Design a protein around this ligand. Structure first.
Ligand SMILES: Nc1nc2c(ncn2[C@@H]2O[C@H](COP(=O)(O)OP(=O)(O)O)[C@@H](O)[C@H]2O)c(=O)[nH]1
Ligand SMILES: Nc1nc2c(ncn2[C@@H]2O[C@H](COP(=O)(O)OP(=O)(O)O)[C@@H](O)[C@H]2O)c(=O)[nH]1
Lengths: 204, 202
């Protein structure tokens, strides 16, 4: 029996813990893939769709939610940005905390940035991609709510964003996604499988 | 707007069995059939796809499973009838061909074969019947974990070259139920086939 690319079962992903900040994250070991986006972009719906769970994050918030796909393989749900009607001091603090996670989390292997296909690359979207590429993290951009566009317009948006992300000095993949129509889940699973194939040498 | 749906194969459930195509349910919706030599790894592949230990069984019945309303996986009884009388062998081989040629709702055939010994016994006849009936084929080279990466790729390339001889659409992929590898390729093919809704049912 020889090594092969594993297709992990994301429907067995389960909640393990939350953290109020990076100082209270679990040990910086294994593999993490992070998810981020503007509030309301569709991040919780995408995670719910990927894992076939109705309310994966157990929401009843700046909490970081962590989920295990398997031992040592975690999805990290970063609190949505934008911060409607928030004081400038808190906004800067919360934005910096996202950057600190991307730059200092040694077990981080990929970042999924979710953004509405109709309004991509707004608010902290570009800064999140830039921080990831500076830290040698591969990025998957999911253009969410892709069911709101007809096929021609959908492809035009995907192409526009693919052209735009060439300006980042790193590896940025762009895919349309719809939680509502359960479309694009395959592209997400393929990216996750590629990232969870990269076992830390000191743990293998 | 319409999009390519990624169906949840882990929710697949058993619907019915049938001894022959005359006792199958209504010839509507979409079926994708699975076939291979006995012991090639067909039940393991279906059980891996669906994350179920005993959905597909192995000890001449056709077994039908439903992914969603109108979308079915069809488990055809394995061929390579060791020590079966020649009369029964011919009849059971003909029954497989009759299903492929006469099932109007059939949209794809998955032929599973050991990566070490592809295209043996009824393998080529199953592919040929499918292409003659304008059915797309996915060949899964099973037990691919038994080969190192170089030899695995060499077998895949050799089978890809060989299936050019069939006058149809034949995709070839390595697969391992043991290592849970190649499941994405299978899901992609199934999703593509289940995207093709019969016009009279849309
Ligand atoms: N049309 C459509 N609406 C979506 C989709 N995903 C999310 N939404 C809607 O967008 C809103 C915010 O989604 P949610 O997942 O809670 O966003 P989050 O704040 O980023 O976690 C809700 O009204 C969802 O129903 C999608 O794929 N298609
Ligand atoms: N190494 C390995 N063995 C496998 C794989 N799939 C099936 N087998 C073994 O091959 C035998 C036959 O598999 P099975 O799925 O029962 O075959 P079927 O008769 O075609 O349904 C069993 O001993 C399986 O454990 C695989 O991917 N890798």
């Amino acid at each position: 029996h020889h090594h092969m690319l594993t297709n992990w079962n994301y429907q067995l992903t389960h909640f393990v813990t939350s953290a109020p900040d990076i100082r209270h994250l679990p040990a910086d070991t294994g593999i993490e893939v992070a998810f981020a986006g503007r509030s309301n972009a569709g991040k919780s719906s995408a995670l719910n769709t990927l894992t076939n769970q109705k309310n994966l994050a157990r929401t009843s918030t700046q909490l970081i939610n962590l989920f295990e796909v398997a031992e040592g393989k975690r999805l990290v749900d970063l609190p949505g940005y934008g911060y409607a009607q928030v004081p400038e001091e808190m906004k800067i603090k919360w934005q910096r905390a996202l950057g600190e996670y991307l730059e200092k989390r040694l077990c981080l292997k990929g970042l999924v940035v979710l953004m509405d296909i109709r309004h991509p690359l707004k608010d902290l979207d570009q800064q999140m991609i830039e921080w990831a590429v500076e830290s040698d993290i591969q990025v998957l951009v999911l253009l969410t709510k892709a069911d709101k566009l007809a096929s021609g317009a959908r492809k035009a948006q995907v192409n526009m964003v693919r052209e735009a992300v060439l300006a980042f000095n790193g590896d940025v993949q762009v895919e349309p996604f719809s939680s509502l129509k359960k479309s694009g889940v395959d592209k997400l699973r393929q990216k996750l499988d590629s990232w969870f194939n990269e076992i830390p040498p000191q743990e293998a």
